[PDB]
Design a protein around this ligand. Sequence first.
Ligand code: SF4
Ligand code: SF4
Ligand code: SF4
Lengths: 49, 318, 45, 176, 115, 155
Amino acid sequence: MELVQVLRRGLQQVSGHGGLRGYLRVLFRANDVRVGTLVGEDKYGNKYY
Amino acid sequence: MFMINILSLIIPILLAVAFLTLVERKVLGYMQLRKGPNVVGPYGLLQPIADALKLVTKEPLRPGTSSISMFIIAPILGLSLALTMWVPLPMPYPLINMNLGVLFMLAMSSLAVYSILWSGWASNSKYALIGALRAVAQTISYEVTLAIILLSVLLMNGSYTLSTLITTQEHIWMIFTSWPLAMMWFISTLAETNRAPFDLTEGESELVSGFNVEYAAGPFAMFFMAEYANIIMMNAFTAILFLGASHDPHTPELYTINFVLKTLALTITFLWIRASYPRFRYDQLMHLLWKSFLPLTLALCMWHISLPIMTASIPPQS
Amino acid sequence: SKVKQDMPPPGGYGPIDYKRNLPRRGLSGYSMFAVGIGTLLFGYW
Amino acid sequence: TYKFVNMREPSMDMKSVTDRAAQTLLWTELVRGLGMTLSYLFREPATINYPFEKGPLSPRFRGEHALRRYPSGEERCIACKLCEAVCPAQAITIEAEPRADGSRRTTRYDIDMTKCIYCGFCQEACPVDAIVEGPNFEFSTETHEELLYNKEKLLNNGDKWEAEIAANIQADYLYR
Amino acid sequence: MNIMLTLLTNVTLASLLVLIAFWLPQLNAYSEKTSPYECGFDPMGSARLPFSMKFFLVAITFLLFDLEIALLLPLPWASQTNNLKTMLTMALFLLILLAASLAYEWTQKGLEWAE
Amino acid sequence: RGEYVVAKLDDLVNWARRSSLWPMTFGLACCAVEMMHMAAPRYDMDRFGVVFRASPRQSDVMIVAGTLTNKMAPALRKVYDQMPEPRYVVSMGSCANGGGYYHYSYSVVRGCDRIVPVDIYVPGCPPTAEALLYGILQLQRKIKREKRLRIWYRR
Ligand code: SF4
Ligand code: SF4
Ligand code: SF4
């Protein structure tokens, strides 16, 4: 059942990244698929995960 | 619409070769703990486009110490033969029903020497002149083993009609009857396409590239296209020859799916072998076939010609 | 304060394996030849 | 003591010869490596997403040189020229002078980054921790002149990478 | 027609690829590019000299074996004959002669890549 | 007008060049080993479309990795002179950029620039693998800002 579990997690990350638009933006710009906790934000506009 | 079918044969093979240059760089890297190309588009899907554009718009240098006629003809031969050698393949309904399809394609398989020799000599470099003869000797000395293996395998099929080969297998995978033979055949295929275990022509210590040294940009990329089209073509040949599949005439798509899956699996085995094994030496390379492969192939051919007679199971001629 | 620095734990350290533990796997040569010949024979039948 | 590496000669019974003949004919060690590489294919790929993720470092990391300054804002360099006498590549050049206030600061303090070999000898030589090497390594330039630093460039480096250098020194001065 | 049409399509397609390859890009055409290459140097005064070789024997025994491969090619059609016994003995003769030629090649150096 | 079409076309071309630069290795000293570490699993140069392995005939960028001595200089010169256009040469390491530790030697040239044009100066002794990789990315952004056909159309 870990296969359907990882399928569910893969469909969960598309929700974690602010929906389809945010997910596609992250995939195309940052070459990343995973979502981490926002540990901080600098003045210039970079999110630290 | 015949020409439309032709184009539907060439063009998809061209995209297949193009994305093979991505799947190899991904498979190899993952085999050696590398993520592979995933920056050009999603999961590196767009990467083959960029390198192709670069090589098209890269400067093609004319070899000053060369006769341009062969410097241009050799890519023509290598590429055109590689694609037209896809013509008689048994897709559920093969494009051209040539009565001697297997012999047709085996004969065209020998023609790659006729690009190798002109590339190696016309470019006029030491690495080129060495690698031309070395690679020529490789491929010609393995073509014989390919020939006896093809004959011995076919002696149970019935004829040289390559469409009836499916009808030969139908029940059981043909490898189950000729696994000793296929094990040689596959390896000889690995030798004929000049792959890392058996390449011997690149040899990036003493041959560097062997034949594609002075070739640059487009004519250079054409030989890669030939090389990584022969990969798919011979893996597909082996796939049908030994790894049979079902084919219901009312549903042609089923055999198509099974066959493409077999071809992908065999190409992945190609990449699998190259990602692990060391590279042969010319001494051992020809020792492998002259001393070891050829006697076993001769004996197996004798076995596979005597077997249908004693079992009273000669295959149907028509 | 007492002097302290990067030191091994008081119980030393756990053993570090160095012997080649290359695994052994595979049927007997007779078994391999037998299974190959049996698959062959089924194929010919 | 010593161990002989390859004296394990094989036996010659029927079982051993059959096994060796099978391994030679029915390629086995070949398949062994072919399956090991498969195990490495399904594993987790070791790859760091640059530049989004950077490699791990240490507080002792030696990188771009920089000229720090006291909490009051005054530059720590008293131009003792110890760092110039220490740099094995002689990439450091100082000219000193009695300033208007008087404190002997450097009229000229330039480090030839193309001559520098990034050893950290200057910082350990400095008796006031004036010269230091910041954690920055992201200063790959386009022109050779861009690399040849000046006193003002070193001061700007010390004023940009400053919280970094202060934090690293606070975490490392006890070791040194 | 059909088959010939496929061969024509493939050769013209290949020629378009080479034409775009050799014509589209732009080159400054400066002289020192023409200097040949060998791992950093140029191939001195060679890459066309007669090639003192030894595997010529392997090259020629290739052809000598290729004739016999051509001889044994008709086998799949030949197995469909009434007098199977003669076909069996005589094909077996052909493969035995293959093996005997290889063996004489073997013991008398021969296929042993000359030194 | 023509700027739209020519800019889109040359943007396509320079993107294709940018994501498929092929290094000509050329490691002379410890900078070579650091570059090799940069192609190791961790940083994985091969991900970015860079291929590390490249014969000098089929290559886009030379990394002068290590000290360049007098005896080497003619060989490096013949290698670069044969390099097809476009050819951007990056110099890694203080030794290759200019002088080095052995700046005041007798058989070491005082910089790759005195031998061959340098497009990106990568500092470090050695430049830690990711610094090299950042220099490669800087060259990629340089290829992004390329206006060949614009200048042709606006010559
Ligand atoms: S690390 Fe600093 S002190 Fe050492 S050689 Fe380089 S510039 Fe001079
Ligand atoms: S050692 Fe420190 S104080 Fe002395 S000249 Fe160098 S930077 Fe200035
Ligand atoms: S710059 Fe440093 S690492 Fe590079 S070659 Fe010179 S001494 Fe070696």
